[PDB]
Amino acid sequence: NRRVIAMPSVRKYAREKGVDIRLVQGTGKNGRVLKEDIDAWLAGG
């Protein structure tokens, strides 16, 4: 449907930070998840 959108390094960072791009709304370019997004996610908001 929407699939995962994130940098090759982000998917790894989130994948490591128990974060899934699915739970992280990327706001990069076309809504791609950035490392900043991953971190913000874990923070809660």
Curated annotation (Swiss-Prot):
Q: Which superkingdom is the protein from?
A: Bacteria
Q: What is the lineage of its organism?
A: Bacteria, Bacillati, Bacillota, Bacilli, Bacillales
- Limits of the Peripheral subunit-binding (PSBD) domain: 5-42
Q: Which residues form the signal peptide?
A: none
Q: What functional role does this protein have?
A: The pyruvate dehydrogenase complex catalyzes the overall conversion of pyruvate to acetyl-CoA and CO(2). It contains multiple copies of three enzymatic components: pyruvate dehydrogenase (E1), dihydrolipoamide acetyltransferase (E2) and lipoamide dehydrogenase (E3).
Bilayer-crossing residues are none
Q: Which organism is it from?
A: Geobacillus stearothermophilus
State the encoding gene.
pdhC
Known partners and oligomeric status: Forms a 60-polypeptide structural core with icosahedral symmetry.
Protein name in UniProt: Dihydrolipoyllysine-residue acetyltransferase component of pyruvate dehydrogenase complex
Family classification:
Belongs to the 2-oxoacid dehydrogenase family.
